Structures are given as structure tokens and as C-alpha cells.
């Protein structure tokens, strides 16, 4: 196994692991303030998704300020997973690319 | 089995204090909210406050006069409601309920009739 | 915060007839309501889950509807068990609330 093939899968289980807490810790914080809809935890796993894959959508977010916090650290987890499946890709064709040259 | 056990009766002297109990069983998960619900007596049912065990934060209503205070043993899987400085207006039925972290309540205790009395 | 309605508060029936509880809620909730069953002395007990899921040990004859602002209850061939108190409970945004209860009155 290759580094950016181990990153990729690890970002995968890291990015499962900050949807899950995310969802608990977004239920935690967000009742108690009110007006709040994000408030359950199948919903709040909803919304996790909605915010790491950055759809967003709008029918949940937070209005907390610890909700919001959980908000931006599964917001940058999941465009930082998105990305590093990307730049794997890359070094997987820069360097299948290096073996159509010869090199 | 009875999976919310509370006690029958308290008797609490006008401004006193009383600190209700609410003993579980059954499936507890980390998920686990544990509400209390007063009820007065011909009246409905009114929300109280929530508690989760597994991390000890409490919510209450907003729109009351706040009189109490919500704990949990969480070696015990026992949920504390601590009421006190009571008059008669807070002589009712106090029900807790188990929420799966799901919005609805799957199960209700027995309740515990508070009488504020000399 | 979110207020139920619940008009009106007794509903009289025939044995056997079909009855139906009615719960409004102040603002669009989705589907997020819950029914509850409390009989004279007893413990509330969950009926209807969601608007329409079901749960285990409810009889068949409970159902339920609406989304959004109306949501109803009915009951198919009311019986004598059936006379409690019906609540309505939401849980679309925080803090949950419930209904001012509707009572069950069967005509025999």
C-alpha cells in the first residue's frame, strides 16, 4: 500500500469518525437554545453530511456558537477528504502518466 | 421489566427542598435523554427539563419559573431531580420519560406525587 | 417557542365509531409530532411516532396523519379501553412542547 492510497482511506474513516461525533456534539450543543432543529441525532447525521460534503440545502444548521464550532470542523474535514482523494488521483495518473513515458 | 422506577410520594414542607429519583434499566445507550414532566393534577402535561447521563448537560424551559436542577449517577443509571424553595403550585405529578435522542418519549416512570403540605 | 392546539378539548362517540383528535402546532413542523395515551391514573404511553409510524403493542386500530401544521389521530371502532386522554408532542425544535390534551368520551 502506497501513502496517498493510505491517506485516502484513512481520511475516509477519520471523515466517518467527525461525521458520528459531529452529529452527537451537534445535538448537544444546539438544545437548549431556542428555535433550534438540530436537535436529533438522525438528522443532526443528516446534516453532518449536508456540511462535509458542503451541499448545505439548508433545511438544518446550527445557531449555537458551539454548534457552529462543530459546524466549521466538520465543514473543513470533509473539503480536506474531498481533496485529498483528489490529489490522490493525481499522483495515481502523474505517475501511471510517467510509466506511458518510459521513465 | 419496569425500565423508569420512581418513587410513590414526597411530602415537602412549604420552602422546603426534595430531590426526586428516577432509577433505569433496560437498554442504556449514550444517546440516552432522561425528561421530567410535571403534571398537575386535572391539568396536562408540562416539560420540564432534559438531562443526558453520558455527558451530565441540562437543559429546562424556558418559560418557567427554573425549580430544578437535573443530575445523573452514571454508575447507577439514575437521574436526580432536585426541587426546592416549593408552594403549593408546585404540587403535581412528576413523570421522567426516556428519549432515544429521537425527539419522542418511549417510556414513561410510574411518577412521583409531590405534596407540598404542613 | 412551538404551541399545540388541540380543539376541541372532549370529543364524544358511539362505541364502534370512528373518532379523530386534531393537533396544530404554531408553525410548520414537518412530521415531528408524537401521540401519547394517558388514562386515569396512569403513566402517558406512546402511541404514534412520527405523524403515522407505528409502535409495537399499540393495537392496529391507532393511526395517524398530517404534516406540517395539522396532524390528526383517529382510532377505527372506539372501545370503553379507548376513553383516556390523547397529547400531542413535537419535537422540531428545541424545546419540545405538547398539546393541552383531548379527552375521550364514549356515548354508550
Known amino acids: 500500500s502506497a501513502l496517498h492510497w493510505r491517506a485516502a482511506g484513512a481520511a475516509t474513516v477519520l471523515l466517518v469518525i467527525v461525521l458520528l461525533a459531529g452529529s452527537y456534539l451537534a445535538v448537544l450543543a444546539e438544545r437548549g437554545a431556542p428555535g433550534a432543529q438540530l436537535i436529533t441525532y438522525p438528522r443532526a447525521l443528516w446534516w453532518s453530511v449536508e456540511t462535509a460534503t458542503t451541499v448545505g440545502x439548508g433545511d438544518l444548521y446550527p445557531v449555537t456558537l458551539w454548534g457552529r464550532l462543530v459546524a466549521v470542523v466538520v465543514v473543513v474535514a470533509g473539503i480536506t477528504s474531498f481533496g485529498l482523494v483528489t490529489a490522490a488521483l493525481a499522483t495515481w495518473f502523474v505517475g501511471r502518466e510517467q510509466e506511458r513515458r518510459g521513465h | 421489566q419496569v425500565q423508569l422506577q420512581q418513587p410513590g410520594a414526597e411530602l415537602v414542607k412549604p420552602g422546603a427542598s426534595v430531590k426526586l429519583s428516577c432509577k433505569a434499566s433496560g437498554y442504556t445507550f449514550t444517546s440516552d435523554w432522561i425528561h421530567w414532566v410535571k403534571q398537575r393534577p386535572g391539568h396536562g402535561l408540562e416539560w420540564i427539563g432534559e438531562i443526558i447521563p453520558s455527558y451530565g448537560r441540562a437543559n429546562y424551559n424556558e418559560k418557567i419559573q427554573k425549580k430544578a436542577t437535573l443530575t445523573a449517577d452514571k454508575s447507577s443509571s439514575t437521574a436526580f431531580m432536585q426541587l426546592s424553595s416549593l408552594t403549593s403550585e408546585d404540587s403535581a405529578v412528576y413523570y421522567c420519560?426516556?428519549?432515544?435522542?429521537?425527539?419522542?418519549?418511549?417510556?414513561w416512570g410510574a411518577g412521583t406525587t409531590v405534596t407540598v403540605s404542613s | 417557542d412551538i404551541l399545540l392546539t388541540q380543539s376541541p378539548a372532549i370529543l364524544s362517540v358511539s362505541p364502534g365509531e370512528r373518532v379523530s383528535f386534531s393537533c396544530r402546532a404554531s408553525q410548520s413542523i414537518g412530521t415531528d409530532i408524537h401521540w401519547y395515551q394517558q388514562r386515569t391514573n396512569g403513566s402517558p404511553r406512546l402511541l404514534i411516532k412520527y405523524a403515522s409510524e407505528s409502535i409495537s403493542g399499540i393495537p392496529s386500530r391507532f393511526s395517524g396523519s398530517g404534516s406540517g401544521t395539522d396532524f390528526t389521530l383517529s382510532i377505527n371502532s372506539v372501545e370503553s379501553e379507548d376513553i383516556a386522554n390523547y397529547y400531542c408532542?413535537?419535537?422540531?425544535?428545541?424545546?419540545?412542547?405538547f398539546g393541552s390534551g383531548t379527552k375521550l368520551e364514549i356515548k354508550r
Open positions: 420519560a426516556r428519549e432515544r435522542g429521537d425527539g419522542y418519549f418511549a417510556v
Open positions: 408532542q413535537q419535537s422540531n425544535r428545541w424545546p419540545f412542547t
